[PDB]
Design a protein around this ligand. Structure first.
Ligand code: K2O
Ligand code: CL
Ligand code: CL
Ligand code: CL
Ligand code: CL
Ligand code: CL
Ligand code: CL
Ligand code: CL
Ligand code: CL
Ligand code: CL
Ligand code: CL
Ligand code: CL
Ligand code: CL
Ligand code: CL
Ligand code: CL
Ligand code: CL
Ligand code: CL
Ligand code: CL
Ligand code: CL
Ligand code: CL
Ligand code: CL
Ligand code: CL
Ligand code: CL
Ligand code: CL
Ligand code: CL
Ligand code: CL
Length: 454
């Protein structure tokens, strides 16, 4: 089934590297197609014939429970657009070990591996990693920073849409994330480009391959296609307080006599600061609890109220024609990635991600907990001590003070809130352009509203 072939494919690649090195084949010799074919064939026969011991990270009880869950509850994905396919990956946050996965509805009927093989746009699940996480890390925004959701157009002249909405006005990062508004993410990524932030540095540290970083829609998953396993590794990094561990299924390959062919070597990388990661955890907690883009917390509270009280964070995504839905879930111990869609890229129902995938993934997390009662953990995500806490205006997301509005000095006062920052100095004093993005017209409207309240 999926685990047999995924494991064999990875073991064959590791055996290929081992045999080439053993036989002293140069990097140049390895470029020769005939030599590669020979070593791929030799690697396959060595595994087939050779009595190697392959040690995996798979938790057999958990993986078996995940197979039973998709067998029993996969039908909950069927939304009237034909049989819906599915991929899930369960990853240990502290190691990057893959404990179990779902490759699809039924290997016997369709062998396509939707956990490791299928690549689709991650849509809005890109935003925490590529936009907000980097902006916070770079000290360009904090937890209560204000962003423009005023109407604006892409470079191609098309309005940036959110379902049928061309936008609203200013909003907090929390509102932007809970709803997954698109315009704020557009402005955030534009700010990173304008500031010459090495976004590629962050994304490549987590193993993402993105061909063009200048794509305006990158934060909405334009110009990016990922496997469930790779994308689960991105969320692993945020959950693990910003420290990436490379995903893996194989821990070791030994000969019969115990010679080591291959052994996974941990290379932990601090991709985001602990401050950044722990701020993002707090924001993604509210994404699920707000229940705006997913019913997951309602589904899970009914199935397993005790497990629903574990410290869940996560994020949804929907591609623009409903071809792909994503739900990424973490507790401090584990990350579970989930994709649904059709092999031929035809549309799902409008609610497929909001309701169906949320209900299926609530069943999947419950099945995992029933197989391994302690595996999700009862630990909480918590702000790192290095987090800077700033008292800022609710209105501007910046510290109270005076600003020139229509040429006149205005004392900007009002309700304050604690804003969490990952820099040294925290939030700046309020400036006229207090938000991420916005036109002059947007700022005229925003300030007219704010001045009205003083
Ligand atoms: C999040 O999931 C939001 N939707 C998206 O991210 C969709 C629009 N993303 C994609 O379909 C990927 C390609 C980029 C499209 C950019 N605009 N166009 N065309 C959801 C909350 O709206
Ligand atoms: Cl399997
Ligand atoms: Cl497979
Ligand atoms: Cl040999
Ligand atoms: Cl096991
Ligand atoms: Cl992969
Ligand atoms: Cl896609
Ligand atoms: Cl515009
Ligand atoms: Cl939407
Ligand atoms: Cl909200
Ligand atoms: Cl870049
Ligand atoms: Cl990738
Ligand atoms: Cl670039
Ligand atoms: Cl592996
Ligand atoms: Cl041997
Ligand atoms: Cl740090
Ligand atoms: Cl909740
Ligand atoms: Cl609900
Ligand atoms: Cl979404
Ligand atoms: Cl789509
Ligand atoms: Cl199909
Ligand atoms: Cl906290
Ligand atoms: Cl302060
Ligand atoms: Cl600073
Ligand atoms: Cl800006
Ligand atoms: Cl304007």
């Amino acid at each position: 089934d999926y685990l047999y072939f995924t494991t064999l494919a990875e073991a064959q690649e590791r055996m290929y590297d081992y045999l080439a090195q053993r036989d002293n084949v140069s990097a140049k010799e390895l470029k020769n197609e005939a030599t590669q074919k020979f070593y791929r064939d030799l690697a396959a026969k060595e595994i087939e014939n050779g009595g190697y011991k392959i040690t995996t990270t798979i938790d057999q009880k958990i993986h078996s429970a995940m197979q039973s869950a998709v067998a029993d509850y996969g039908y909950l994905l069927d939304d009237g657009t034909g049989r819906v396919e599915v991929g899930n990956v369960l990853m240990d946050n502290q190691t990057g070990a893959i404990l179990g996965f779902v490759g699809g509805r039924n290997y016997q009927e369709n062998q396509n591996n939707h956990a490791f093989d299928t690549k689709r746009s991650p849509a809005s699940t890109t935003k925490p990693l590529l936009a907000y996480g980097i902006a916070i890390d770079q000290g360009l925004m904090g937890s209560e920073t204000i962003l423009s959701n005023y109407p604006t157009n892409f470079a191609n002249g098309n309005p940036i849409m959110y379902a049928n909405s061309k936008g609203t006005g200013m909003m907090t990062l929390g509102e932007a994330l809970n709803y997954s508004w698109n315009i704020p993410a557009y402005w955030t990524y534009r700010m990173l480009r304008e500031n010459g932030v090495d976004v590629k540095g962050y994304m490549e540290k987590m193993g993402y391959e993105i061909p063009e970083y200048g794509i305006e829609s990158l934060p909405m998953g334009g110009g990016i296609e990922v496997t469930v396993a790779q994308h689960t590794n991105g969320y692993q990094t945020l959950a693990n307080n910003g420290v990436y561990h490379q995903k893996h299924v194989i821990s070791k390959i030994e000969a019969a006599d115990g010679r080591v062919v291959y052994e996974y070597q941990d290379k932990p990388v601090q991709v985001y600061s602990k401050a950044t990661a722990t701020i993002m955890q707090g924001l993604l907690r509210e994404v699920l609890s707000s229940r705006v883009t997913t019913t997951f917390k309602s589904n899970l509270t009914s199935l397993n109220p005790t497990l629903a009280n574990a410290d869940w964070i996560g994020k949804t995504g929907t591609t623009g024609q409903d071809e792909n839905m994503w739900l990424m879930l973490s507790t401090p111990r584990l990350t579970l990635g989930g994709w649904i869609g059709h092999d031929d890229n035809h549309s799902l129902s409008q609610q497929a991600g909001y309701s169906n995938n949320s209900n299926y993934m609530a069943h999947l997390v419950n099945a995992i907990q029933q197989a391994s009662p302690s595996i999700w953990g009862n630990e909480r995500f918590a702000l790192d001590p290095s987090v800077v806490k700033s008292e800022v205006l609710k209105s501007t997301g910046q510290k109270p003070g005076k600003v020139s509005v229509e040429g006149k000095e205005v004392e900007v006062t009002g309700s304050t809130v604690t804003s969490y920052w990952a820099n040294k100095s925290g939030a700046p004093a309020t400036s006229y352009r207090f938000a991420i993005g916005g036109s002059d017209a947007d700022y005229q409207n925003a300030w007219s509203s704010i001045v009205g309240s003083l």
